[PDB]
Design a protein around this ligand. Structure first.
Ligand SMILES: C[C@H](O)[C@H](O)C1CNc2nc(N)[nH]c(=O)c2N1
Ligand SMILES: C[C@H](O)[C@H](O)C1CNc2nc(N)[nH]c(=O)c2N1
Ligand SMILES: C[C@H](O)[C@H](O)C1CNc2nc(N)[nH]c(=O)c2N1
Lengths: 105, 115, 105
């Protein structure tokens, strides 16, 4: 069996057409003493990354700000900050409520 | 790593499922459809969202506003989902593959098909 | 191909304050006579289990009532009430709307 904790967040950005992006992050690991990893630590890691894009024009930070590339970047940034016994499992980024990009490791 | 684009849409249809040899009472729902297409991120894209949505909505269009018991012998959520999956697969460009189809009958009950 | 039916339900419970839990259960099996498993039957099985949690003191049942442990608790009792030809595929438990645990078999 595989266990994961999920956190959902959102941020607004433009690329120009501004959107409200909904981000879902799934971190996989083992349930140790009732916890995989506390939600607040993960959520802090995630927001610390999304805040760099919040209210910005992604065309100034990304060569080509496609939802896929933004999702990719976010995944790499998250990966670099997660704790030792945990892995980035899934990243789902919705460009508005009806369209999204799912990245699964 | 796998990369997919997801497109969400909805359509409404009325129907009654078989409860033995006889039928339940007819009623309508808003169906929520989630389609996941997997492929490689080329030039920053897997597949254009709108291109996928059009393929999917042309399909749901045949079900939209219709009595499903007139289209399916047994309009269960699984048979409808299967039918949608097959229709989509048949229309997808040669560089992607149908990965997932999630059909919700309302927001409380749904069927998930994965390839 | 794999086919699953999914049911969503909700229950409120207190532990340590109280929360509104959102549960999503996915059952994998083959489609026979047009369906994997009757939606109501699963819903019955699931809500009979959640009924034992509804507005309860979770610390009376769990030494450490974390979201993960509660998810494991539910996953197990569901596996014990399921019919012979289907399998518990996934359990997603959201404590509130933006934080959840996902168990996958
Ligand atoms: C009230 C809330 O349930 C409590 O603060 C927390 C915090 N962080 C958590 N983190 C995890 N992984 N699992 C949990 O159940 C909780 N619960
Ligand atoms: C406004 C619209 O969202 C934008 O032009 C698009 C269109 N199609 C897309 N298609 C993919 N695959 N990824 C994207 O980020 C976008 N963005
Ligand atoms: C009204 C209700 O949705 C209808 O009677 C049901 C019940 N159980 C079901 N169970 C499955 N597996 N698939 C379905 O479409 C339904 N439909």
């Amino acid at each position: 069996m595989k266990s994961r904790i999920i956190v959902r967040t959102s941020f607004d950005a433009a690329h120009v057409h501004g959107h409200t992006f909904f981000l879902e992050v799934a971190i996989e690991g083992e349930i140790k003493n009732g916890y995989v990893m506390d939600f607040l630590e993960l959520r802090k890691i995630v927001e610390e990354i999304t805040k760099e894009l919040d209210h910005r024009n992604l065309n100034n930070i990304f060569e080509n700000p496609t939802t896929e590339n933004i999702a990719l970047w976010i995944g790499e940034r998250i990966r670099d900050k997660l704790p030792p016994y945990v892995k980035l499992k899934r990243v789902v980024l919705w460009e508005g409520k009806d369209n999204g990009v799912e990245l699964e490791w």
